[PDB]
């Protein structure tokens, strides 16, 4: 039973380690999505200007 | 191409979560395989004890694994729904946004013209209007103000910690039972060893 | 070699990690390795009930459970690959054992498998000069010794 | 009102699927509860046989139930995605459709 409990604790520790990189990657992706959207909107606002 | 890139990124996140669950699963199934078959060595070792241990470890998938899987599935569902929202309000409706903003500026131009009393588009205005049509206030809020992916990840982490704690409590029950047996044995031993009285 | 273990443990095969969990690497000799390999799913109950097999497994520090048997077989086969402990003499011993256990599949796998680098005499010289260095260090720190 | 009605209908379908799985689950868990504890009657009966039966029936969740649950979850996912599609292309974009056609 102690072995099983130790395995669980090890898994928790590994998750806590990996979330450091994981959350920051997710934040980066958030920012990337927003900037892709803004680039699309900039292109469309450029071409609406043509179109004048 | 942009939409495909974002889809790939979403897939990446889901894959990472799946990998976490798979790690845990591998460990738990190895435990099950080892202890569903452990057999007593020499007589006096309580056959029933070992049998019950074997049964418990056999059921250990149900005991330790399935809730984590359910949590993973829920998180995946939420991620997929968020991607669906981003797709259908932005990365497909760009044509519609173009038509709407373009026609709005056309109507504004003609309204300007209808001032025939001798008493027209800026680029910044166009950019803001196209941004509004693409729902980028809503997606700014969902990407940065209340980051959805980050929320999902924290949900996964916090609930998996809760599950681990519950499993630990459940196992503490088993250890307590074993402790009962141990205490009985030690009582007998101390009784034997203190009969010099 | 998961296909091999499915072949020899068709339904009683368990969830197991294919690497040598071995702790000593000299834990058992080659005849005992051959005996352990010949615990095919058709003889396994008889072997487990056999007193001499139980004595052997107590000598080796094994159980008579199925999972530990399969794990030990895995480790034996990985040592046969990597540390390259077994010759064709392992195959000899399995042919000898075929009096009891008609273990053809493991025999064929041992036959048709890229073996490894051998590297014996270099390892001998390394270990011997390790021991020479230890002897020198002992000499440093008494005259009789 | 129309959108809420459709949402309720979708919920209904999902609920029916869940009920099916729950039926099966109830039966499977009753089997598990009965036969994880069956104990031999007579001197000459195989204690080991019964022990192995007890372990197997205890493992019967993993054995008989989980695949069905996974299938149910898959179906629910797809249903929710379809409702989202219908919502976001029709029952919210009616304003946009009006503006565009007008």
TrEMBL record, chain A:
Top-level taxonomic group: Bacteria
UniProt name for this protein: ATP-binding protein
Q: Native species of this protein?
A: Campylobacter jejuni
Automatic annotation (TrEMBL), chain C:
On the tree of life, the source organism's domain of life is Bacteria
Listed name of the protein:
ATP-binding protein
